[PDB]
Design a protein around this ligand. Sequence first.
Ligand SMILES: CC(C)=CCC/C(C)=C/CC/C(C)=C/CC/C(C)=C/CC/C(C)=C/CC/C(C)=C/CC/C(C)=C/CC/C(C)=C/CC/C(C)=C/CC1=C(C)C(=O)c2ccccc2C1=O
Ligand SMILES: CC(C)=CCC/C(C)=C\CC/C(C)=C/CC/C(C)=C/CC/C(C)=C/CC/C(C)=C/CC/C(C)=C/CC/C(C)=C/CC/C(C)=C\CC1=C(C)C(=O)c2ccccc2C1=O
Ligand SMILES: CCCCCCCC/C=C\CCCCCCCC(=O)OC[C@H](COP(=O)(O)OCCN)OC(=O)CCCCCCCCCCCCCCC
Ligand code: HEC
Ligand code: HEC
Ligand code: HEC
Ligand code: FES
Ligand code: FES
Lengths: 163, 109, 56, 210, 267, 53, 216, 216
Amino acid sequence: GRPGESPFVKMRPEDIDAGGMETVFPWRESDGDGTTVESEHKLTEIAMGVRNPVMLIRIKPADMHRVIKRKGQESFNFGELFAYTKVCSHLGCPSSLYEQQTYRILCPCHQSQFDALEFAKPIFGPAARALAQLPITIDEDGYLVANGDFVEPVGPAFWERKS
Amino acid sequence: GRPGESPFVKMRPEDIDAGGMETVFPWRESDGDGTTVESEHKLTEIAMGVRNPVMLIRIKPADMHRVIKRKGQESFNFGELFAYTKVCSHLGCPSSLYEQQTYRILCPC
Amino acid sequence: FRLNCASCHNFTGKGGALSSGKYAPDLGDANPAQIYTAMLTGPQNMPKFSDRQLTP
Amino acid sequence: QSALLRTGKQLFETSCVSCHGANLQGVPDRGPSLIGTGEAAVYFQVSTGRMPAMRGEAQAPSKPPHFDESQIDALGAYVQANGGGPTVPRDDHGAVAQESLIGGDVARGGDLFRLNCASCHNFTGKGGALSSGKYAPDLGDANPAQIYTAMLTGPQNMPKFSDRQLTPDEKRDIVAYVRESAGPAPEGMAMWIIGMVAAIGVAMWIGSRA
Amino acid sequence: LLSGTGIRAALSGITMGIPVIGTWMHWALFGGDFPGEILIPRLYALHILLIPGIILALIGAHLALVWFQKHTQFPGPGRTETNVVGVRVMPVFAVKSGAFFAMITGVLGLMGGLLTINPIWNLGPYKPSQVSAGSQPDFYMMWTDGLIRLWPAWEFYPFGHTIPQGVWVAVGMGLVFALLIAYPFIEKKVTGDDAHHNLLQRPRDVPVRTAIGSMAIALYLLLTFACMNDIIALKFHISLNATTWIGRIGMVVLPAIVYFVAYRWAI
Amino acid sequence: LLSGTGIRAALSGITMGIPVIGTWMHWALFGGDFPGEILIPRLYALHILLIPG
Amino acid sequence: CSPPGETASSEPGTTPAIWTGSPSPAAPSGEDHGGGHGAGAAGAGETLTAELKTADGTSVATADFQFADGFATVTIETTTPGRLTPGFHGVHIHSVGKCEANSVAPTGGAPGDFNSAGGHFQVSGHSGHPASGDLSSLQVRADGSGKLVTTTDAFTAEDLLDGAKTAIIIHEKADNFANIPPERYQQVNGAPGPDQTTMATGDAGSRVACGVISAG
Amino acid sequence: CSPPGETASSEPGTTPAIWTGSPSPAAPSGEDHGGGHGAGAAGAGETLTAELKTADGTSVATADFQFADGFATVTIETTTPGRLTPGFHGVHIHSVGKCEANSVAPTGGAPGDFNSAGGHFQVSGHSGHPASGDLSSLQVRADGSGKLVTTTDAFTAEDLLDGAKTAIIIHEKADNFANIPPERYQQVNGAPGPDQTTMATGDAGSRVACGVISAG
Ligand SMILES: CC(C)=CCC/C(C)=C/CC/C(C)=C/CC/C(C)=C/CC/C(C)=C/CC/C(C)=C/CC/C(C)=C/CC/C(C)=C/CC/C(C)=C/CC1=C(C)C(=O)c2ccccc2C1=O
Ligand SMILES: CC(C)=CCC/C(C)=C\CC/C(C)=C/CC/C(C)=C/CC/C(C)=C/CC/C(C)=C/CC/C(C)=C/CC/C(C)=C/CC/C(C)=C\CC1=C(C)C(=O)c2ccccc2C1=O
Ligand SMILES: CCCCCCCC/C=C\CCCCCCCC(=O)OC[C@H](COP(=O)(O)OCCN)OC(=O)CCCCCCCCCCCCCCC
Ligand code: HEC
Ligand code: HEC
Ligand code: HEC
Ligand code: FES
Ligand code: FES
């Protein structure tokens, strides 16, 4: 929350602990701290990206055995780390609410819950499509980095989708 | 006129030559180049200051003998360098139209 | 140009009137060498823009 | 370890010789003797929520820790070598154990909690209020080692439970309970009552029923 | 934060879910993706000049129609379909209308003072990554929001396409507005009465219409409280799923109950 | 540039000129010194809604 | 309807591999400069470090040598607090970069950290006086640290980028260079001249540290 | 009406004096500081330069050494293209910082640039082995330039600010330090040990360069 300077800081898996949720953003080395004028525009773009914010969830190791995985998203999780888009699959509000020991990602706009244990499929509310899962891993030095891109469009659905 | 970075750079008397005018601004060492975000707001303020811009004019040495000075402004000039506000004294438009060989600062407004 | 030239010529290089019988001619006819030399030397009532003031 | 005692003395000499002078000897009316308190008691303050407050007070805030995990270990080994007492539960690697301190029983991990300790806290694990200016803190922040160290090294006005009083096993079970356990709307209604009933009643006053 | 979240939900999602032209309407309105740099200027134009201008023109038409199509009146002693019994404009009606205007603006000023409305300072600046739990629109759009919440996540996927749940609520709003606009013609087609009516009829004297209006008001209240189910669940201790499903079941049960009760009550 | 210098001359200069209330009128209209950051929004309102109305 | 693609219970998956980001192509071709230097050879740049280790495999010193504006702006820091004893370790530049525990390039005794192919690694065209191969005494006190520099630029980055990697070797002697002149002092054989072995490079007892300057 | 204040025919004026701005009291709460270092003394900081001149006033070289993180990083740039001949030079730290052309602290011949109050400017508590009083050597090729570093940290920024300013004095010898061991070589009098004057500091002919390290 630092006002303006170094708003986005690299992250490591150890930072989260079991039953922890952290909102992360797609930061590039080129998108350095906000000190420069060239930066603080790339960083503002990152912050204002509608489809940018993601929620990184540390699934409790005890409950790791209840996890079901989607087609083509089986290796997306890094150990017990699951990165799901915050944007709700129905009308695109962030699904920022997270319930641990229930593993339910709740959206405040229209009360839709997604089962984080399984692929983040909606188990209540208006949402009908699962939240897109970001592939994640650790680069050299252990910092968390996306292992690719979402295998599906991430925002709310529209006519030209599912193909 | 560099677009954004180092818009204001320090100045030296030798840069101007007799019968030359240059628009200068009040730059501070603290108001460094526009690379940072703290800077480029100080620099924008300097640029957008209504009363900030000044014209530095080099009076020719031959014509230096025609200069008549104001009370309390006799020592203001540095040799043959005279710094006058660009803002016209009447309604505040810049008076940028400097005519040498007549030494007349004309306002276009 | 706007900071220095438009002062008397125009926004877009047209001419402008000066104190008494003088004027700034329209630049449309000047070729690049003539424009550069017009800056380099102050012909009459145009400030002389040295290379130090306006580097090449 | 030779380095752990050495680092501990340097960090001790720069924080608590003001209240525990020299080799863990308490300053009278400023702080207690630290002889016999041991690593886990040191774990229960700087490592745990209740780091000691420089202003004297009935209770302290679990203020943000002033020492890092290697430092908390160095400070602790200094007081366990100087004093001799309880040691913080540690895993096979040598880190302070947290998951291992998660007890298998939560049912009995709970029953233990209610007879022993539930009362000063809350059955939920929410705080309770206690003696003079003393409160029992919410145990939501506490990691499992923190939980085991409040019980083994009784902090302040918190009954001390020895490994004999509550076995090492039950303390884990206790951790399992006290961790497993851990505009438009008002504005529109205010319109429809205050403003709209006012307007409608005013109209009924001005107008005529018929 | 609050109002931008509301915009992101309704204006963006609903618009972009519409099958044939949804994304095109979204991009035309926002000048691009959702956070397009022209949304608020466009809404400012629409809200200070365009829509208020149309509202002023339609209010002028409304008042002129009421003025020259003399106001209807309830049946009474001397009141017939070919006369207006009341008070003349100058002495009494004008003074009481002006006084009522004074009192209404006094109520509004008192509420503006004593009751806090929309503390935007509390509601931080809009950021797509941030959100609250309330996330409601004003009470007049609360029924649309409640429809969004209650409708049961029915999505259709034609050949290589998606038909999100937003279209359901969009069509629902379209139907609501069409029915509201076309009711008098619907009522005249159904009943058969095209007679020039100048005497009102008491709601009790028309059991079917008062029953239908009570049913519609019940549905509107159900939707409005469904939009508030979050705070209702929070304060009045009722599970959020329970509130959602209470709304879902009621929006077909409560209208029927209220219709029957209102019909019998009128009779 | 043209419209801005025209504004600077007419509005700002002639407003500050007025003897007893000139500077006060200037500060009320521009919300401060001449380049005050509310001038163009205020003119936009006056020009699309108020004066056209 | 339900989304066409869901519910793949099978294929449990695998742990993602460690990400190895590719360098930014011509698109984001911008990258940090690795150091400007004359580089009169295949290219070394203005960045070059090295670790002078001991016979036990432990780092003793850490040197850094690199051209900045045509001259090597170097710096050396002791990697341990007790590497050098309370005295002056004599530094030198050996042509052979192999910082082995003990080696002998010629046919003879293999001194500890004596992998140098001679004495001081002078320039290609210079083999007389103590050229850039030679170095003076750097002192480590009871604290046991080393950090101090001089101006020894008989060679440059081009000369350092020679056929064989060079090394910095610190023995246990000072820098005198026959301080006893022939006027008064005499040698073993009675000649007042100095010793060639002592004049070519700093000769001392067993080498204390040695580190290859090939970006070690 | 004309404005009240205009026109001044008399009092021709004066040329404005050279501006001497003052440090900001308002913008800066305190005084801005440059190099950061422990500086266990009255205060020297992480910035210390020096200019080693010649007997005729010519700049022999320009050294600069400063503490950064407990280890002093140093570097010397040649002041002239031919300050040093095509050979070697020995640099030593002298306790006396006076970089005079010729001086003699003791009662004896005054050697060129011999203002040092003894040999190597060792630490206060160290006077035996060649402590930090000895600096790295300077090897000059036909190019005649100086740039190289060693690890000499027996003294630090705290010890640099001693009772008297120190200096770096470069004579024109190599770095040997009695490289002829007593086993083979012998002294003038037949003893196999080395010379005390040679062991104390790098002894050579007339000093070539000398520069005070008191932020010269
Ligand atoms: C979509 C939908 C309707 C889902 C169902 C959830 C729901 C609304 C359930 C009913 C809520 C209630 C009445 C809870 C109390 C427990 C309960 C159910 C008791 C039995 C109900 C029953 C049949 C009782 C018999 C007698 C009877 C009719 C009692 C009614 C009692 C009440 C609460 C009457 C008022 C109704 C009411 C205001 C309900 C809450 C609705 C809203 C939107 C309140 C808005 C509001 C809120 C939420 C504030 O926090 C607030 C804070 C500060 C100032 C103002 C306000 C404010 O106006
Ligand atoms: C910090 C700060 C800025 C604070 C201020 C807040 C702000 C920005 C704005 C509010 C400030 C103001 C100016 C508030 C007062 C607003 C105002 C004009 C109130 C007037 C009420 C008043 C003072 C009454 C005094 C009592 C009295 C003697 C009344 C009789 C004389 C009067 C005033 C008669 C007025 C008659 C009246 C309301 C005319 C309205 C004109 C219009 C638009 C339509 C006329 C009209 C009407 C009214 C119908 O009802 C109607 C019904 C059916 C068909 C047609 C019509 C029709 O044409
Ligand atoms: C919140 C609640 C939802 C919102 C509610 C508002 C919408 C309008 C409300 C109700 C509409 C349905 C009314 C009931 C319609 C009656 C049907 C019938 O059987 O026709 C008998 C009639 C009497 O004729 P009669 O000589 O008196 O003979 C006595 C015989 N026993 O015939 C006719 O003239 C008319 C025949 C055709 C009528 C067609 C009306 C609907 C037009 C389409 C608009 C959409 C409708 C949406 C419905 C919700
Ligand atoms: C009054 C201030 C003044 C400013 C400042 C000034 N000009 Fe001019 N310009 C003049 C005047 C007066 C002349 C007429 C010179 C002459 O006729 O000899 C002129 C002549 C010229 C001409 C000759 C055109 C022709 O066809 O003969 C060119 C080209 C020109 N200016 C370009 C420039 C450029 C480029 C600058 C860049 C800052 C500049 N001016 C700035 C006033 C000005
Ligand atoms: C006033 C400043 C103050 C500082 C700073 C302080 N303490 Fe304390 N300490 C106290 C007071 C008062 C208590 C009594 C409260 C209690 O018993 O928990 C206490 C309690 C303790 C206890 C529990 C004794 C027991 O058995 O009840 C331990 C262990 C302890 N301190 C160690 C430390 C260590 C280790 C540090 C710092 C590295 C430290 N303290 C810093 C004042 C301080
Ligand atoms: C009065 C009886 C009492 C009993 C019995 C008791 N506590 Fe406490 N506890 C306290 C008081 C008072 C404090 C405040 C002292 C302190 O925090 O230093 C406290 C401190 C704590 C803290 C401090 C860390 C934090 O969260 O801020 C934790 C955790 C804790 N107790 C949990 C337990 C657990 C778990 C048990 C038994 C399984 C237990 N307590 C037994 C009253 C009690
Ligand atoms: S916006 Fe997320 S469920 Fe509707
Ligand atoms: S604006 Fe009038 S003379 Fe300048």
